[PDB]
């Protein structure tokens, strides 16, 4: 009854063409749907009851949503095996790898526009009573219009399948303190994560906290340290990400506030020309 919203697609409408993701229990393909490019995720024979519930539950959750910044479900193949979930095809893949492969290639306005799209998707999820728990640039997909869409939906499968999530099982350095310390995951802990995504975007995919271990990150945060300004970062953007990292959940902006601020900055783009000071790590001097 969450699945009866989803379209059942017949296997002869679907051609898998190239592997673009993979795991032990299936893979993701670029393909064509009856013609239109699509992404195709499979679940291999022998799957458990829990695996079937998790897998079709991702499609069930995605089919409840209709928003420009949330990956769109085309349908499912469940009456034939292997079972499949079919979605729109995002031509530029995961945002973290995309940024690292395109370092320096975008304007500051383009980067901020990507953040506004992610925030808009997150406001929608939050208002739909969906807590993501694993918001990170690796879980955002980018299309050929530079539109960023939130992906990676489900219940326990989200944190269980993410290699960044370490033994609870949590992607520590994207996660808010209260979610680490007492398992309180809410839209406000997703705002903390969004602050981290802001920093990943503005740095072209630098790894948060560099080589600090998970314990060192948790200790730094609890002692009040925060990530430093990216290079060439608008002051308003650094101010906003810093407010996402308030220790006190109630002091963080809501996604509604984030979308509003980002929309105003984009509409007055000269506001983005004032840069936060960058703390240089190397001094170079010449006589």
Interacting residues with ligand 91K (CB under 6 A): 20-21, 28, 30, 39-41, 58, 71, 85, 87, 89-90, 92-94, 141, 151
CB of 18 to ligand 91K, least distance (A): 6
Three-state SS at 237: helix
Is 25 one of the annotated binding-site residues? Answer: yes
Exposed / middle / buried, residue 106 (Cβ in 10 Å: 0-12, 13-18, 19+): middle
Q: What is the dihedral of CA 58, 61, 67, 71, to 10 degrees?
A: 0
Q: Among all chains, which residue has been given the structure tokens 């795991």?
A: 23
Is 24 one of the annotated binding-site residues? Answer: yes
Closest CA to 246 of 174, 184, 187, 195: 195
CB of 150 to ligand 91K, least distance (A): 9
Exposed / middle / buried, residue 72 (Cβ in 10 Å: 0-12, 13-18, 19+): middle
**Residue 74 φ/ψ region, left for φ over 0, alpha for ψ in the -120 to 50 degree band, beta for the rest:** alpha
Is 70 one of the annotated binding-site residues? Answer: no
CB of 2 to ligand 91K, least distance (A): 15
Is 27 one of the annotated binding-site residues? Answer: yes
CB of 109 to ligand 91K, least distance (A): 23
Neighbours of 215 (CB within 10 A): 9
Is 20 one of the annotated binding-site residues? Answer: yes
**Residue 22 φ/ψ region, left for φ over 0, alpha for ψ in the -120 to 50 degree band, beta for the rest:** beta
Closest to ligand 91K by CB, 93 vs 228, is 93
* Active-site residue flag, 134: yes
Closest to ligand 91K by CB, 122 vs 217, is 122
Closest to ligand 91K by CB, 139 vs 246, is 139
Please state the φ and ψ torsions of residue 281, each to the nearest 5 degrees. -90, -25
Closest to ligand 91K by CB, 52 vs 251, is 52
Catalytic residue among 54, 96, 134, 162: 134
Q: Binding site: which residues?
A: 20-28, 41
Q: Binding site for ATP: which residues?
A: 20-28, 41
Q: Which residues are catalytic?
A: 134
């Amino acid at each position: 009854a969450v699945l009866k919203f989803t379209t059942e697609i017949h296997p002869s409408c679907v051609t898998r063409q190239k592997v673009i993701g993979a795991g032990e229990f299936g893979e993701v393909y670029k393909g064509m749907l009856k013609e239109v490019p699509v992404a195709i995720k499979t679940l291999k024979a022998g799957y458990t009851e829990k695996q079937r519930v998790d897998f079709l539950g991702e499609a069930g959750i995605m089919g409840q949503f209709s928003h420009h910044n949330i990956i769109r479900l085309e349908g499912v193949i469940s009456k034939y095996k292997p079972m499949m979930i079919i979605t729109e095809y995002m031509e530029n893949g995961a945002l973290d790898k995309f940024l690292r492969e395109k370092d320096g290639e975008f304007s500051v306005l383009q980067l901020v526009g990507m953040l506004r799209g992610i925030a808009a998707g997150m406001k929608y999820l939050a208002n739909m009573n969906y807590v993501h728990r694993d918001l990170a640039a690796r879980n955002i997909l980018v299309n050929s219009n530079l539109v960023c869409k939130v992906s990676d939906f489900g219940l326990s499968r989200v944190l269980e399948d993410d290699p960044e999530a370490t033994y609870g099982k949590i992607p520590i350095r994207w996660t808010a303190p209260e979610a680490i310390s007492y398992r309180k995951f809410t839209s406000a802990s997703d705002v903390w994560s969004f602050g981290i995504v802001m920093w990943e975007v503005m740095t072209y995919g630098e790894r948060p906290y560099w080589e600090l271990s998970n314990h060192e990150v948790m200790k730094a945060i609890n002692d009040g340290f925060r990530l430093p300004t990216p290079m060439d970062c608008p002051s308003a953007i650094y101010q906003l990400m810093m407010q996402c990292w308030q220790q006190e959940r109630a002091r963080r902006p809501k996604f509604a506030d984030i979308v509003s601020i980002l929309d105003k900055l984009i509409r007055a783009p000269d506001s983005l020309k004032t840069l936060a000071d960058f703390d240089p790590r190397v001094s170079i001097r010449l006589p």
